[PDB]
Structure 1
Amino acid sequence: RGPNLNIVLTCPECKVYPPKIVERFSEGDVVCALCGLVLSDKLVDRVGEASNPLLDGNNLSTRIGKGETTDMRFTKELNKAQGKNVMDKKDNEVQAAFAKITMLCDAAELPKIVKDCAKEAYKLCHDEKTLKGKSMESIMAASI
């Protein structure tokens, strides 16, 4: 239901499909294993931030904080303005639930995997018709 936009590396001379391809990382080359012809060269192997697309999905956001020189008025006003966002309000509930789950697990001295799985279960089971009249405490406990 969309454009292909797929690149397949094959040796024009050998014509064998599928081809035997070797990725010489040290030499930065992709070479046909049979004839030795180079198919693609100059292959590629803090400036960014990491995220887990299993507990937060696709949600890019940045905080506001003090710097080497800053006035408290600007920070307070900017945080106030950022708080009054309608689109981000929906996911802030999930984030708060995650925070409470983390607090409970940490107070329970449970391993990191336990709280990660609890957050995943909460996210998967949230926003459904069946669980609409049950207390958040019950939801969190069941997820834990």
Structure 2
Amino acid sequence: LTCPECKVYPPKIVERFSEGDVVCALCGLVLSDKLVDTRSVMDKKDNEVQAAFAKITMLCDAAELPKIVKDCAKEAYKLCHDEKTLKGKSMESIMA
């Protein structure tokens, strides 16, 4: 996305979102015209993942833990979720 006229390799441009345009702040040429606003079970191996999710969720409830902690634990489980270094471990050790 570059100004044909001004032609600076890092293009100093501005987005006049209120007009929905994109402008070469140097020469003033408009570059793009319409700015799209945007602002407003077994076939997947997530079966074990969701079992872990449900147990994790109920445990988070029991602990009264923040949703951020719940998400962090879910993400950590997803990060491992399978390994020889895991090798089973009762599926509750990994939850904890």
TM-score, normalization: structure 1?
A: 0.60
Identity %: 98
What number of residue pairs does the alignment pair up?
94
Check the 8 A contact 2:21/2:30 in 1, yes or no. yes
- State the 1:138 CA deviation: 0.9
Q: Secondary structure at the match of 1:30?
A: strand
Which 5+ residue runs of structure 2 have no aligned equivalent?
none
Q: Distance in 1 between matches of 2:63 and 2:3?
A: 58
Check the 8 A contact 2:53/2:74 in 1, yes or no. yes
Q: Given the superposition, is the C-alpha separation of residues 139 and 85 from structure 1 closer, same or farther in structure 2, using an over 3 Å criterion? A: farther
User: Which stretch shows the higher mean deviation, 21-30 or 89-98?
Assistant: 89-98
Q: Given the superposition, is the C-alpha separation of residues 137 and 108 from structure 1 closer, same or farther in structure 2, using an over 3 Å criterion? A: same
TM-score, normalization: structure 2?
A: 0.88
- State the 1:88 CA deviation: 2.0
Q: Distance in 2 between matches of 1:24 and 1:85?
A: 19
Which 5+ residue runs of structure 1 have no aligned equivalent?
1-8, 46-83
- State the 1:133 CA deviation: 3.2
Q: Distance in 2 between matches of 1:85 and 1:10?
A: 29
The root-mean-square deviation of aligned C-alpha atoms, in Å, is 5.5
